[PDB]
Design a protein around this ligand. Structure first.
Ligand SMILES: Cc1cc2nc3c(=O)[nH]c(=O)nc-3n(C[C@H](O)[C@H](O)[C@H](O)COP(=O)(O)O)c2cc1C
Ligand SMILES: Cc1cc2nc3c(=O)[nH]c(=O)nc-3n(C[C@H](O)[C@H](O)[C@H](O)COP(=O)(O)O)c2cc1C
Lengths: 216, 217
């Protein structure tokens, strides 16, 4: 029952470090990251999955200054996912995507592949050549991925918290992301909440539909 | 899984069967999904237009013009069509609305707790508006996060859908007078049941391998 899932999930404020993902769950979260949809199947993303003490410590360097309120979450969760966007959309990536779609059997003819490549480049060029918003466009797809992910991990029976409160320059530097062509956007600790998670027992709150939603 | 299966089996529907409508229950449930998405600071910087009448869907479909004409039938034939909109600016009235709703819903034990929450939210809001100069993008990002939640959600309800960026947001904004109301359209998502014309229903799903996209540490 996915509505039950959506209503019962919450942003976890404290994790029980002793409660690890099962081997299975650890693979299933990777599956979720991989299989998110994205505009033109552009998949303009990279994920860091930190499951070791050393790994999580490296990520937690980013919870500095104004962001110390997020350090323990990064340290204490079983697994921590860093969602990264490409910094620019290049033709090598676009060829990578269409070639993969071909390998997977999505095209019956050379003509169908070529039409798919043309359609993808129409959108990619709109953003990188005309609007000059390809960095934002790609970051949007990564956020869509995050939204898919948070509901998915909840449906697996796992706790999570999305985090924008981190220093992306520190995180990028720690993992050499800039030279690799990526930048960190959202950190998502995944695991099981502790009794210290004050948010597990508080009511959820949302604006009423009479403000946010119009039916036509 | 109960959800991995859903993720592996869902697809972007290319054609809908117009006769197959959401049940009243399903129509309620999709509204619940829209409302209950998370967002940075619970800022909820969004508005939704849910078109279910033929006349409503037709108005939305007006945006699929020019380069986007072969997204029109998706928008007309689906049972329900959701227009995801972002706020164009994050005003103090909205920030107060959010914290007052949290207070109404019992999230604060004291006035001091409420004030601390409001202060933290205004901190992030001001950073985006004043220093990063990306407040529009920041809000749009929350809307895209909502879309991701929504696509999985509807798939898990056993409903077909397709996310659509192939539309003219200026036309759509004008049709529904969004600019003046402080909003702009980002993504259109028709929801319903696919038809035999949906060529994508039977094709294998394709993603880049994890050895390219994923690093374990
Ligand atoms: C993109 C994003 C970033 C967020 N950043 C943080 C964060 O840095 N620290 C934190 O504790 N919560 C963070 N949150 C959690 C939000 O406050 C939370 O989603 C919102 O209050 C709604 O509550 P819920 O997630 O329990 O439904 C963030 C949420 C989102 C969607
Ligand atoms: C933000 C976004 C916009 C998209 N726009 C369109 C669109 O305009 N027309 C269309 O047919 N499909 C659209 N798609 C569907 C993508 O092509 C699709 O998600 C991708 O090829 C992966 O396929 P899947 O959704 O079947 O898993 C869009 C998807 C996303 C996430």
């Amino acid at each position: 029952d996915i509505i039950s899932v959506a209503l019962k999930r919450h942003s976890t404020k404290a994790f029980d470090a002793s409660k690890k993902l099962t081997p299975e769950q650890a693979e299933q979260i990777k599956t979720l990251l991989q299989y998110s949809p994205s505009s033109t199947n552009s998949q303009p993303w990279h994920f860091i999955v930190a499951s070791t003490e050393e790994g999580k410590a490296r990520v937690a360097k980013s919870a500095a200054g104004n962001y110390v309120f997020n350090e323990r979450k990064m340290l204490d969760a079983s697994h921590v996912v860093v969602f990264c966007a490409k910094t620019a959309m290049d033709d090598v990536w676009l060829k990578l995507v269409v070639d993969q779609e071909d390998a997977d059997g999505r095209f019956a003819t050379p003509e169908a592949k070529a039409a798919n490549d043309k359609g993808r480049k129409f959108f990619a060029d709109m953003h990188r050549k005309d609007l000059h918003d390809d960095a934002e466009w790609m970051a949007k797809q990564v956020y869509l991925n995050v939204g898919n992910f948070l509901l998915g991990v909840a449906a697996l029976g796992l706790d999570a918290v999305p985090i924008e409160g981190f220093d992306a320059a520190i995180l990028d530097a720690e993992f050499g992301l800039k030279e690799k062509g990526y930048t960190s956007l959202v950190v998502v600790p995944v695991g099981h909440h502790s009794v210290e998670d004050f948010n597990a027992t508080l009511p959820k709150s949302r604006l009423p539909q009479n403000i946010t939603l119009t039916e036509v």
